Symmetry: C3
Subunit: 333 residues, 3 copies
Amino acid sequence: LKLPRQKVELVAPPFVHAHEQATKQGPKIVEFKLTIEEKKVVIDEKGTTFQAMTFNGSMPGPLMVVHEGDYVETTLVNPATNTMPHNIDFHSATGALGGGALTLINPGEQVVLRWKATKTGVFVYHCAPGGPMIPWHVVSGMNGAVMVLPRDGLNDGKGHALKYDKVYYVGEQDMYVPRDEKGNFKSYDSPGEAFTDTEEMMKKLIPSHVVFNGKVGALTGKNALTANVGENVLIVHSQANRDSRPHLIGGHGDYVWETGKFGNAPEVGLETWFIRGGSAGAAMYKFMQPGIYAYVTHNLIEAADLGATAHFKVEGKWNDDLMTQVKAPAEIP
Amino acid sequence: LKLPRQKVELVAPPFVHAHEQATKQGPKIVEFKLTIEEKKVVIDEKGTTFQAMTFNGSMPGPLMVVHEGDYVETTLVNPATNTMPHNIDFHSATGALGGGALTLINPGEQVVLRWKATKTGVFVYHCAPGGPMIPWHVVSGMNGAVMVLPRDGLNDGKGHALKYDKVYYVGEQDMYVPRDEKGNFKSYDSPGEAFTDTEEMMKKLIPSHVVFNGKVGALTGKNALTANVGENVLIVHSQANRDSRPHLIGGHGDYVWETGKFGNAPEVGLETWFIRGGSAGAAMYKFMQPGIYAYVTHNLIEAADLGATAHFKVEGKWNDDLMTQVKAPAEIP
Amino acid sequence: LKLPRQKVELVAPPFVHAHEQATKQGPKIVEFKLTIEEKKVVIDEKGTTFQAMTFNGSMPGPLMVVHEGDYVETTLVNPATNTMPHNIDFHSATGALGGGALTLINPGEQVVLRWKATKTGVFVYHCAPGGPMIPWHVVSGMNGAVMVLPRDGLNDGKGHALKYDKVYYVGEQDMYVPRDEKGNFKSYDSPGEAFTDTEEMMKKLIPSHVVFNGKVGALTGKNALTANVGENVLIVHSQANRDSRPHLIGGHGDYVWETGKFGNAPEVGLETWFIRGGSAGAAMYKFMQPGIYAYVTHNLIEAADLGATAHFKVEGKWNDDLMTQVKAPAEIP
Ligand SMILES: OC[C@H]1O[C@](O)(CO)[C@@H](O)[C@@H]1O
Ligand SMILES: OC[C@H]1O[C@](O)(CO)[C@@H](O)[C@@H]1O
Ligand SMILES: OC[C@H]1O[C@](O)(CO)[C@@H](O)[C@@H]1O
Ligand SMILES: [Cu+2]
Ligand SMILES: [Cu+2]
Ligand SMILES: [Cu+2]
Ligand SMILES: [Cu+2]
Ligand SMILES: [Cu+2]
Ligand SMILES: [Cu+2]
């Protein structure tokens, strides 16, 4: 395979490594490295801990971006400091269980997989060792996404280019943290030690936490997402195990690929869209008003009570034509 | 803003205030009033009670109907007879959390919000005070919908008008009523008193009841929906918090906007469609056969056992070409 | 009704009786017989038993295949060896609750229903006796599907024929098996005896098992699905009560009708699709790589832990352009 090679420096979510939308480049071999890290993390503002397993140290794993017809060459590394075997499966790839059947590595090993990016869209990647370990590694955090762009960039299905000013990757994670008799969340010394209680809970299908970027409140405060009035923002949303229903509170999905695949035209003007468990989708919005927005799953219990809220802070001029407070709160006459 | 003003007299669901589909009117300021009512109601045929919170006294709140480019001016009233602050957020509107950030009112206050109807479709509106109160006010009943019609009326995406003879609004409500030790549903003296037990249940994500129009059996008997053979009926369906899968038993969705937005063409000939939690959708059907139909969510446990069944009673002539009982029940030969 | 009659010999899922895609035949009366069987079956590899109720002895019931404008004439038989009344409702049919209101039969009776196939697609059929019996009979196994093909066969929405080399029918069943105090699954002597415990569990909305073709591992081993590289395979997927999110691990949905209705163009290049509870959908894929694939619902807990995994074994030549292991597992340098 005699094509040019290009290295990518991955960046942690919700940011996305620099890339072209439309490109004059032809196919390349695009090189990525992912290093697995098992670690105990804090997932809420109460201090609840969680035995996480991650690609590159983050939940979600970083977004990889390539173009149709590129070859994606990933070096997957499982350092000896980890305890379990791992692998990687790309929903964008064809054959061998998405790559999982060619990438099983013990602690202390690495492997190099290449796949051709023949399908456009956003796609999940995740670990999938085998059997009951599959769901457990996924819901422990071992999932991310890849975006395969058309070489002409995105379009609206009517001949017009859609160009985003910025892209964010929101990875949503369903987490299953057991409770003790008195009702407090349990802590564990290792992923192995967490397994029996965690599996019992998993099979009841109700998460204790549903978070963006790994933690309640991760995408708030200093880490709110940002935009300006006038900017077109692409929001890639993934969920490797469980459905979600994204919604931008105060905005819309101007152009939405809820099934996430760019061979299909986007839908327009949505209020709420739907990410099937095991998939990524994408929505574009051009901001029209300044201020705070919340980006949620619109099961509001999950959003407000289980963790699944991000914020945007948007700068610019208020548009009184679009919305105005005609009369401020006052006593009823 | 120097446009003509038009008042609307809202009507209780499942009915919809009179309106034009295609119109020669230009943009107007369309005036609506919503008066919040907290009240204890009965939600099933066993006499289970529920601490409801409502717009205009109903679950769902009434359907508001306007046209693209209208300005919607709502007077939201929170009488002093209520106990909590409330607001309103319109998924159809742009900015300020859908209006919620401009409409927070204490008991004894009112506020007037105006928003421009720049997106066509059916959309949820709901209360969203802040934080954990958001899901609680929604699942207590504080949600409804608005329909923003194209000025040329609805179309099939192929150049042909779709005109409905009648429209119904089915609002679906997931309710969380705790049980006591012996397993009976609990009753509470106030919404505040219901809150701790109700929140604990909410976060487990399983409703005790799933109802249309506020109560088991609301849209049955004297209050069945009606049609005649030959009539094209639009059914708007909303669910502000939780997914639903509508189905007309014995019929179809001839033209369905499951994501609910008229900038997208309808899908045709569906058996079951999908309303994402946090959205409204719409389906049109031209009745071909007389008799009873059930309109359900097609999780049949929720439909038959938790409350989510409506009926249509349809008049007209039976069509033996479409369906016939060739041989009535008889002993096996 | 003076049309030619054609008998079909139904076959057990996941196979599908022989049929034409595009046809030069005009409308016919196509004759099917379904014989209800209540029986206790084993549903997992641990030996858990289940009080099943079936059409033709299988879960799902067999796939019926006809063309648009055919008349489907079904003889439904409820032998005296059964204990309960049953009926049949076709989501493909118009009127009388899909046929249910014309087909209620006691043990020892049969009935003959005819309906005109005016809507194209794949559709659920199921028993629906009335009231709380509706969900119980469905989740006990009394559901299958029918496929109504265009007379010109399937198309891609752009003027091109899609022709499948083979079709499989995957029926997914949510099952509710109660547990005793110590946590073992219960066994029952009759469906009637299982009813009280089973209904209590049903209304909590969480299945104990989610299976394809009636049992954990049914579509594995000797009974794996098969294909060759180059073959275009149609996979019809139904779920009469509960949502599913199909995914072909290592493949894609090349052409997908997730709402299942052929009057709509397929979506292309999907990773995961969505079957609404109460519906059937269909996906086509042309295999490009040999080896084992898993076909799952991509709630991986349900797939790996509750039963919902099938396999394909695919013959042919590996394509190193599409995917290759560049470097086998090795020690990290
Ligand atoms: O945006 C993608 C869509 O746009 C088109 O290329 C042009 O309408 C379609 O063929 C494709 O499905
Ligand atoms: O029905 C709405 C749809 O109809 C069209 O106007 C004409 O095909 C499309 O542009 C739009 O998406
Ligand atoms: O595949 C079905 C689709 O294909 C067409 O016939 C041609 O584009 C559409 O009218 C229909 O929705
Ligand atoms: Cu792993
Ligand atoms: Cu996967
Ligand atoms: Cu409120
Ligand atoms: Cu909302
Ligand atoms: Cu039955
Ligand atoms: Cu049904």
